[PDB]
Amino acid sequence: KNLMLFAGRAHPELADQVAKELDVAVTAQTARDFANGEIFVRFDESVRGCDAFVLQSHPAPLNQWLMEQLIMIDALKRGSAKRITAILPFYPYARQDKKHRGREPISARLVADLLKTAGADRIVSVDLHTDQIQGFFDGPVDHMRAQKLLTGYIGEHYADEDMVVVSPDSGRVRVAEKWADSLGGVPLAFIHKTRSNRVVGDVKGKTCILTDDMIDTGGTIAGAVNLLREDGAKDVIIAATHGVLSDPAPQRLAECGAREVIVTNTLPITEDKRFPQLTVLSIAPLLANTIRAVFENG
Amino acid sequence: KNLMLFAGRAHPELADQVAKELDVAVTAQTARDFANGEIFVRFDESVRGCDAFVLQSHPAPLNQWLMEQLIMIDALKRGSAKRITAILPFYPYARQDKKHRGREPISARLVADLLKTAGADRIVSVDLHTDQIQGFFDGPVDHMRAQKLLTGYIGEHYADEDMVVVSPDSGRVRVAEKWADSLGGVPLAFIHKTRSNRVVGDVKGKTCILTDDMIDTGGTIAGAVNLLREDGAKDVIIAATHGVLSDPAPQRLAECGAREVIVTNTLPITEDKRFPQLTVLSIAPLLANTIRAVFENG
Amino acid sequence: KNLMLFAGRAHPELADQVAKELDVAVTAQTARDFANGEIFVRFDESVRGCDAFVLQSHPAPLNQWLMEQLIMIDALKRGSAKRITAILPFYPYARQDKKHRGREPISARLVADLLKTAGADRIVSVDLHTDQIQGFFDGPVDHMRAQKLLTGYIGEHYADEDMVVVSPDSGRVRVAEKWADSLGGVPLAFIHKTRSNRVVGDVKGKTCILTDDMIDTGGTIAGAVNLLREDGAKDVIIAATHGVLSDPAPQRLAECGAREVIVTNTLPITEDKRFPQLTVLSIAPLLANTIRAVFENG
Amino acid sequence: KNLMLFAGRAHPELADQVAKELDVAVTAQTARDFANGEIFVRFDESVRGCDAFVLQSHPAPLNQWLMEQLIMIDALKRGSAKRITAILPFYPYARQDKKHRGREPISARLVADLLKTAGADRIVSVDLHTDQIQGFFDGPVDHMRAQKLLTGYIGEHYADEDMVVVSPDSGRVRVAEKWADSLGGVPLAFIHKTRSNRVVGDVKGKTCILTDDMIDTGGTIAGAVNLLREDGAKDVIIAATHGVLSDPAPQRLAECGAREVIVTNTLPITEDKRFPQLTVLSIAPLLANTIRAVFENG
Amino acid sequence: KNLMLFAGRAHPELADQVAKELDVAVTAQTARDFANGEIFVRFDESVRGCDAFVLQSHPAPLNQWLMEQLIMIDALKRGSAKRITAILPFYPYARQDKKHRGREPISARLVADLLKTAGADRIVSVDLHTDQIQGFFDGPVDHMRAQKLLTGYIGEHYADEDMVVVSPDSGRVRVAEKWADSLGGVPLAFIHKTRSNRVVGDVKGKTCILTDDMIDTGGTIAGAVNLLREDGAKDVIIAATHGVLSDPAPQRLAECGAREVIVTNTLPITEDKRFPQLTVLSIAPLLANTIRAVFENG
Amino acid sequence: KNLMLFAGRAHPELADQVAKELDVAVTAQTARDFANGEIFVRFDESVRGCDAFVLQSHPAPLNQWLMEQLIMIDALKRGSAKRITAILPFYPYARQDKKHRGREPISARLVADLLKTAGADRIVSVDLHTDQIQGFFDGPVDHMRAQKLLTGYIGEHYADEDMVVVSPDSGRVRVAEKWADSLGGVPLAFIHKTRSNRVVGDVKGKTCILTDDMIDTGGTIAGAVNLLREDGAKDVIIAATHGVLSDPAPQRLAECGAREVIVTNTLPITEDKRFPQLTVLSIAPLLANTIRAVFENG
């Protein structure tokens, strides 16, 4: 048994942090783009017989990084790797996990099928948009949660406060309920959208923990902060696993009232996306523990 | 039986030309990008029971357009399309059709597998880098040739000349041999590369038809023009199916001695890629005839 | 002392502008071509004892105009002109000022020798491709700069903007640095080419001043515009001294994103080379001042 | 000692003929134009230590080819060629070899100076407009004559005839006298122009050999044919070394009464300049012998 | 009433063109020369009672064609022609229309008297050197103008240009004034000769229409082109009714800078007089309309 | 009264001989041709009040010399000459003195009318083709005869011989009869042509004097010599006033049997027309006597 770690080019800090935790160097490779956009991949040491972990994050532009991961998995399959696990800290197309009105694809299911066809035996991901995505892949899917990590941090710094957990929309109330339990059985509230916006529950004078899976443009979340403010909240804290933080989100979030915005580094948080209220916690130790347990295999 | 033509956003002029030749409208759809880079696709009329032809060209950035095509195919499969044919005028990753002595992927094979998994029943392509790519897909693959189109044009305008067909490298000599036959049994030459460059055959005082499958950066082809020039060629004409024309190729080709450069519009030839010696012929009539024959059991 | 101004046929508007600033008529001469291409030159008034300034621009076809200037200088030398200054607003063959790793001519040095052999005592030029070309001639070389003229214009119209000076390649960074100083000590960036293209420096949200010595086909410069666009530039302004503007450059520049393209009239900017974003500033006042100072001779 | 033959692009057939006679390949080189008109030259094999012969003919457009020859000589000088001979079968600007009563250049003398400055050690030319041009260059000038070649041909085909040698103007009478001696001491006549035209000498019933150095537009020579016709000449034969043959000369000469027009191939005689009475003799054997003798150097 | 068209031998293409426009055949006749030079004329069908039009152009040698016309008129007078009109598209001896300060003939008047004595009742001519020649003949003289024809052609092809009409000498300014009016009221200039040459008026940057009644040797007109060129004219177009084009005029005009030379076919333009800038318009339709009106009492 | 002698350029020896006999210089004039063929005439001393004699011979090309004479007469008429006599030693168009079949001119009458219209008061000619031409001119016509001159010479050298006068055709028998009387009443013969040739009269063993007005091509006269030879003539002598001697006549007459050919110099007998049997007698003394008698005027 031989553990080998491979990494795409999208998020080099995460790869380096994971490699350090495991005490294993990232496997040498040439990874480059033709002017075309076609990706070229070549492994610069032997991969025959290894237990391979292929780590790729999927920031913008996302389709390029998804193809790079599939190409690496093809190469390991043709190079006689024994077992291939794909690690996708942010699962691409997770939001497209059903048809909605219809005549649509289920893109999250297509991603799992493509990873299977490329040669992946296992998928590891963090905080899927829905837990049912775990059933999209014909094989083991380790669905890691950042909840303990995020609530542990919030518990260390806001234990003194009078807390209410708030879900920014109706889809996320169940997870919010899990957080409220983790924070000592505090109350719960959420934003009801009629197709107007209303807060359902009492937040007056309370420290609100606004929890979401991801922050993309910051529209929904900034709207929620302003609503909670209007309803007499003392404080608002934003916590999410994935900081996609596109477009005006950094500016939007810095200018909204929130005291703190807490994210993990499943995606690379570049200097353009940073702002003073932003705190980034590392997902690396969680990823390293999962790789170790998969590799140890009992 | 109902013919429906779907098109991605990469090359709208080709889609419009094909639609005109068939006398059918392109099917209405919403195709847009989240800031993330994730593609959203929705069909705005019914697609149940149709014979679908999904046309997507693959210019830079290529991996985005490949995912868009796969997503459209997933949607047609879940929308109960009867038969799905993928049309890829320029086949992405065609150059990566073997390992080149390890440890590499066979990306051209991966593309065919991903198209199969998405739900494609047939692939149609024009002038594959190698003919053996036809065997990469478990199903019908119509491999269309632009040879008649390109040699017909050269025959109209250079019948008066004393011609030699020249292959810019050892890989393309067989196709070059076919062109020489089409042009009335004229002589043949090619550039031999030792790992220096040498012309093998007599070109002195002749009008050279330099033929390639594609022009990417123009490095190999410009080198060949200069070599033929040094060996006393009266003129040089460049003909290729695919104008990828990345980077300095336009400057490079315009500045090299070539009298004419002839390409098809399998890829969109934007105004940045244009130059005075450049001629673009339409591949649309050929694509329309192939679709009609596939559709009509012709 | 008697000032006489002679002009070739290549760029009559510049000659007329310079003549007007000096209040001196252009000296009468017969300048015509045999069918052969041989140039015939004859002066139609006396030139004995004059301080002669021979003005010739060098647009396409360039070698003809170079020979016309050499022939005029020979005639002035045999007609007993006292002092002969050659004015070459765009110095022909300036790009060929070194060997580029053999086996090449140094054509810029050949031009200076030929002008010396013909009888020229001085050379006047505007924004040489490299400053070292001044050492190629055994005698005075007045190297005039359009920098103040171009940055003055940019200062009047874009002072409100948040500027970065950008060099389109590694060769021009020093001149770009001079411009940044002229524009109030603004930041600096340049395009790095690995032998892929990358912008080095931050341009996100800034108004980019892309500076080059000349624009020929517009390939490199259009490429740089697109790269800056991709990196989140608000605006791009193109500024260059010499508008050679051959081939597709007018169409290429008009359809790239640039808000303005600023050149001088060292070369004639014909109506085929014009487009809406194009601004042409006159080099005539600068040339007239230099002639006056040379003529006044203290 | 190593003989190397370099050729410009103006007259490839002559270069190929000369190369064949010597049994030496033309040296490989890249010779191409920027859109500007600037010529780029590079030698593709070593030239260090060679005896170089740089062959360039000077058809329309002439100044371009003159610059190409100067540029090649500069490159050989900087590439450490041992000895450089310029071969100019038709000497450009030979007609401008004096002032013609002022204020004109002596362009033929300028050409020799420019060739010297570029690095030429020798000049080889064929039938200079005046023999004194040999003194314009500070160094060896081999002035080759086509007289034996042309009178040899006329002797084989018109020995039976009753011949008079006729000069089309007062400037060429001495050379005409040399021809009359070569043809067996036949009589002499010439066209006298008063500033009306008159033939001086008896041509009635005789076969006239009209001799000139070159034929350009064919105006003077066609005029002379008609004058000789009016004076009762049986036949007129035109013989000249250089067939410049611009404009209407081919049509003019074909429709004037002349039975034959004999030229050499010092200039390229393209298919547009051909007509039935035209005979072209090769100058190549003469050029190859001269190169060999210069190279052998005793 | 019976229309009969007779033609001399000088200009057969004009006679055929006129005959076609009228839909009449040229009357059969024997016209031949004794070795002496005496002309023999005989009509080979009846001419009694006809309205005769005797068409003769007067190229070199001119006195022969004048006698032929007089002889034909004598024969028609003795053959009982009812009315005889002489058509002389180029009026011979028109330049000798006054004594020029003695002791000279008035040859233009003599020509009219000789035509009257031979039996002519009318004279028709095109663009007489002076309009007063109309008074030299005791009878009707239809003086036709080619102005509309020449300015119509110039208007079609140079309407886009910024025009000035230029007279090559002081004698033609009035006609030049008429042309400027026809061309839309454009400015006027002319060449002043002191007995030096000077342009009077502004031509700088303008397209000059140099207009004359005839071009003979091309001396005056070539001089004018060079003068306009020296005064900064963008271009020069030459237009004249009569192309006499003797001697070196073709060489002279082709070598001067003029972009176009436009003439009519009042004289036969043989292949020796042709050159590339030369355009010939037919005077036949104008002649046919005049004959029809004279014949029809129109 | 003041005698002035003017001469055209056709026959300068005759003019000089006549001038010498009269002791009067030929009046100075400029007489030249434009390339056109138009003649320019100017008198270089005063002609007012003179008795003018305008001497012109009319060799080939004849119409030019006829126009020159008419132009000179016009000039004398406008220069106030008192009396103008035209001298035409050979009267042009004399052979066309009637219509023959018809639809012909009477060109001899047209010549007289043109001379009258030009301003001539008198015509002097030698040996008109028919004596009735004297009635074609409305005024004095001095018709001079060379008969005494020619028979006087024949009497000096052939008195010893047994003579018969022979007319070469039926038209000339009367003049031949006059000669026979002048030679002492010798017999007469002539050639009868049937429309075959026959001699009518006895010439056997006799010295034949073949007499004609002129010799043109020599066809008729050579035919007559051969016929007389066949009929047993001892000798044949040819005598004619006018030696036109065109074409092969010199060769024809030299090769026919004739012992002597006697002509006058009414036309210039150039060296091409000379042969050994040819004798030329001067008409000058006869012309000088006629001028003197006209001038003396009683």
Numbering used by the authors:
A (entry chain A), B (entry chain B), C (entry chain C), D (entry chain C), E (entry chain B), F (entry chain A): 10 to 204, 214 to 316
What is the paper's account of this structure, in its own sentences?
In this context, phosphoribosylpyrophosphate (PRPP) is an essential molecule for the biosynthesis of purine and pyrimidine nucleotides, of NAD(P), as well as of the amino acids histidine and tryptophan. The M. tuberculosis PrsA (MtPrsA) catalyzes the Mg2+-dependent conversion of ribose 5-phosphate (R5P) to PRPP using ATP, and is the solely enzyme responsible for PRPP synthesis in MTB. In this context, we report the structural and biochemical characterization of the PrsA enzyme from M. smegmatis (MsPrsA; 87% identity with MtPrsA), that is the first X-ray crystal structure of a mycobacterial PrsA ever determined. Our results demonstrate that the enzyme is a Class I PRPP synthetase and shows the typical structural architecture common to other PrsAs.
The final MsPrsA structure contains residues from Arg9 to Gly316, with no electron density observed for the first eight amino-acids and for the stretch Arg204-Lys213. A Matthews parameter and a solvent fraction of 2.11 Å Da-1 and 41.76%, respectively, were calculated indicating the presence of three protein subunits in the asymmetric unit. The physiological hexamer was generated by applying a two-fold crystallographic symmetry operators to the trimer. The resulting hexamer is endowed with a 32-point symmetry with a two-fold axis perpendicular to a three-fold axis and shows the subunits arranged in a propeller-shaped cyclic assembly with the N-terminal domains oriented toward the inner side of the hexamer, close to the three-fold axis. Each domain consists of an ɑ/β fold built on a central five-stranded parallel β-sheet surrounded by four ɑ-helices with the N-terminal domain (residues Thr139-Phe146) containing an additional 310 helix. In all the subunits of MsPrsA one molecule of acetate (ACT) sits in the phosphate binding pocket of the ribose-5-phosphate binding site and makes specific contacts with residues defining the R5P binding loop (amino-acids Asp230-Thr238). As the crystal structure we determined is the one of the ligand-free form, we analysed the R5P and ATP binding mode by modelling the ligands in their respective binding sites by optimal structural superposition and energy minimization. While the R5P binding site does not reveal any significant peculiarity in MsPrsA and is confirmed as highly structurally conserved, significant differences are observed in the case of the ATP binding compared to the human ortholog. More significant instead are the two differences observed in the ATP binding pocket where the recognition of the ribose portion of the nucleotide is completed in the mycobacterial enzyme with a Glutamic residue that replaces an Alanine in the equivalent position in the human enzyme (Glu113 vs Ala105).
